[PDB]
Design a protein around this ligand. Structure first.
Ligand SMILES: CC(=O)N[C@@H]1[C@@H](O)[C@@H](OS(=O)(=O)O)[C@@H](CO)O[C@H]1O
Ligand SMILES: [Ca+2]
Length: 482
C-alpha cells in the first residue's frame, strides 16, 4: 500500500514557478516571463518524474478549496463557500445565511478519515482552515488526522520569522502559529520549521511500519509577505516591488521544503512507494501588476478571489517520488513521466484518485463531485469525466456575489448583483479562442449565454447550492434575464 503526500501551497497560482504550466496548441509547455522570475528547482525535479496539468481548478479562496479537497465535494455541496474567519461568521452583506461557516464535521467521510479507517497513519502539518474557532473542524484530529502540527482555524501566519515566534513574540498574535514553540527565538523560517516537523512524522510512520497520508499544507505563500533572507539576494527586477520580491522568496522556500521531503523519502528507501500530489489552494496572490487586469497569473487575467481564470487556476503535478516500472503499487497508477495533460482536472478529483490508489473505495453511497484521475495521469483524454467546473461565490472579495460555469470551450460569469437583484448580469468567454478573457462575447452569442445560464442554474440546484440574498433576505437564484 503506497504512502501519499498532498503538498498544498497557500495562494500559489499556476505561474508562481519556474515550471511552465501554460500549454501551446500542441499540448507542449510554453515559458512565460514569470517562469524566468520564480526559481523552483525541486518542482522541475518533480515535473521531470511526473505529469503537469495545464488546466487544474480550485475554488477562488482558501476554506472552500480545502473543504473540496478533503470531501471530494464542490463548495455548492459542502457549503463552505467563503474563507472561514475564525472568530466571527463572515457571511458578508448578501451572503447565504446558512453557509457552512462552522466548516468540516466529525461525521464527514473526508479523504483522511477513510484512509485512517483503513489503517493509514494520517498526518496534518501547517495550515488547516477547515473550521471556525470552537467548531469540530478547528482541530484536524476531528476530521480523520492522527497527527496535527500547527493547524487550527487560522488562515494565515502571525509571522514567518522564528525570532517573532510566528506571531507569539512579534507580529499578529491572534494568528500566531501553534505547536512550534521549540523554534521560537531561532532564525528558523516558518516553512523550514514545518518541513523538519513533516520529515520527523514521515520517519516515525516508516519505523512504526504503517503506510501514511501526509497533508503538507504550507502557510507559504500567504501574506504577510515577509522576505526569507536565505533567498532574497536572487530577486532584483526593477519592476517588481519589495512585496513581490518577498513573495518570490516564499515560493523558493516552499520549493526547498518539497526538495527536503523528496530527499527524506530517498534516505528512508520509500520513494518508490510514495505518490506526491502538488498544487495550490486557490488563484495566485502574487503582488504584481493590476488585480483585475494582468499581473498575479499573467498571461491569464485576474488574481486570488476574482471571477477570472487567475482566481482559480492552480499548478498541479502528480509523480511517484522515484518512478520504477518494476513497482507493484505504481502499476495501480502509472504516470506518463515528464508530460503535460491538457484535459481539465479539479481539486474534487483528488478524493477518488487517492482512495483508489490507497486500496480503498469512494463510499458507494457518498455523493462526490470528483472523478478518478487515473486515465488522465497515464497522459490520455478521459471521456468518463466532463470538461466542467462550477465555482460558486455568494460572498464579497476582489470579485463579489458571482458563479462561474465552465462547460467545454465556454465560461459563463453570472453576477447576482444583490444591490440591484432584479437586474443580474451574465458574461460569456470562449476560453479555447480567448484564454486571457479579453473578448467578452455574450452580445454576439446570446443563445450560448442563455443555454449556459439554464445549465448552470440546473447544476446549482443538483448540488444543493445556497444562494446570495438581497438586503431583506430574498433568495437570488440565477435566471435568464434577457
Ligand atoms: C484579499 C485577501 O486575499 N484576503 C485574505 C482572505 O482571502 C483570507 O485568505 S485565504 O487564503 O484564507 O482565503 C484571509 C485568511 O485569514 O486572509 C486575507 O488576507
Ligand atoms: Ca489560499
Amino acid at each position: 500500500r503506497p504512502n501519499i503526500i498532498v503538498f498544498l501551497v497557500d495562494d500559489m497560482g499556476l505561474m508562481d514557478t519556474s515550471v511552465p504550466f501554460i500549454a501551446d496548441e500542441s499540448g507542449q509547455p510554453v515559458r512565460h516571463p514569470l517562469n524566468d522570475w520564480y526559481h523552483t528547482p525541486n518542482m522541475e525535479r518533480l515535473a521531470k518524474q511526473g505529469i503537469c496539468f495545464s488546466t487544474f481548478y480550485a475554488q477562488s479562496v482558501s476554506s472552500p478549496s480545502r473543504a473540496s479537497i478533503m470531501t471530494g465535494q464542490n463548495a455548492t455541496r459542502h457549503g463552505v463557500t467563503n474563507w472561514i474567519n475564525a472568530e466571527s461568521n463572515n457571511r458578508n452583506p448578501f451572503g447565504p445565511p446558512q453557509w457552512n461557516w462552522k466548516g468540516l464535521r466529525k461525521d464527514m467521510p473526508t479523504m483522511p478519515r477513510v484512509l485512517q479507517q483503513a489503517g493509514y497513519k494520517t498526518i496534518h502539518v501547517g495550515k488547516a482552515h477547515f473550521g471556525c474557532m470552537g467548531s469540530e473542524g478547528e482541530n484536524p484530529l476531528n476530521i480523520g488526522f492522527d497527527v496535527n502540527i500547527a493547524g487550527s482555524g487560522i488562515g494565515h501566519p502571525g509571522s514567518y520569522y522564528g525570532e517573532w515566534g510566528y506571531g507569539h513574540i512579534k507580529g499578529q498574535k491572534i494568528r500566531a502559529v501553534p505547536d512550534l514553540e521549540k523554534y521560537h527565538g531561532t532564525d528558523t523560517f516558518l516553512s523550514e520549521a514545518l518541513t523538519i516537523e513533516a520529515n520527523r512524522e514521515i520517519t516515525k510512520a516508516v519505523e512504526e511500519k504503517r503506510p501514511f497520508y501526509l497533508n503538507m499544507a504550507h502557510y507559504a505563500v500567504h501574506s504577510p509577505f515577509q522576505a526569507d533572507k536565505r533567498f532574497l539576494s536572487r530577486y532584483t527586477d526593477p519592476d517588481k516591488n519589495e512585496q513581490a520580491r518577498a513573495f518570490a522568496t516564499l515560493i523558493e522556500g516552499m520549493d526547498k521544503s518539497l526538495g527536503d521531503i523528496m530527499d527524506q523519502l530517498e534516505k528512508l528507501g520509500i520513494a518508490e512507494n510514495t505518490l506526491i500530489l502538488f498544487l495550490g489552494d486557490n488563484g495566485g496572490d502574487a503582488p504584481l501588476g493590476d488585480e483585475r487586469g494582468y499581473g498575479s497569473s499573467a498571461p491569464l487575467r485576474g488574481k486570488k478571489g476574482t471571477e477570472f481564470e487567475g482566481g482559480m487556476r492552480v499548478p498541479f503535478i502528480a509523480a511517484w517520488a522515484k518512478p520504477e516500472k518494476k513497482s507493484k503499487v505504481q502499476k495501480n497508477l502509472p504516470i506518463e513521466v515528464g508530460s503535460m495533460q491538457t484535459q481539465l482536472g479539479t481539486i474534487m478529483d483528488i478524493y477518488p484518485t487517492v482512495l483508489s490508489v490507497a486500496g480503498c473505495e469512494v463510499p458507494q453511497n457518498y455523493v462526490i463531485d470528483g472523478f478518478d484521475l487515473k486515465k488522465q495521469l497515464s497522459g490520455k483524454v478521459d471521456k468518463k469525466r466532463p470538461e466542467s467546473f462550477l465555482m460558486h461565490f455568494p460572498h464579497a472579495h476582489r470579485g463579489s456575489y458571482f458563479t462561474t460555469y465552465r462547460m467545454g470551450d465556454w465560461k459563463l460569469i453570472y453576477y447576482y448583483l444583490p444591490e440591484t437583484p432584479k437586474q443580474p448580469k451574465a458574461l460569456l468567454y470562449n476560453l479555447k479562442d480567448d484564454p486571457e478573457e479579453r473578448n467578452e462575447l455574450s452580445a454576439a452569442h446570446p443563445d450560448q449565454c442563455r443555454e449556459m445560464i439554464r445549465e448552470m442554474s440546473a447544476r446549482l440546484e443538483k448540488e444543493g447550492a445556497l444562494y446570495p440574498v438581497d438586503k431583506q433576505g430574498n433568495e437570488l437564484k440565477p435566471f435568464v434575464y434577457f
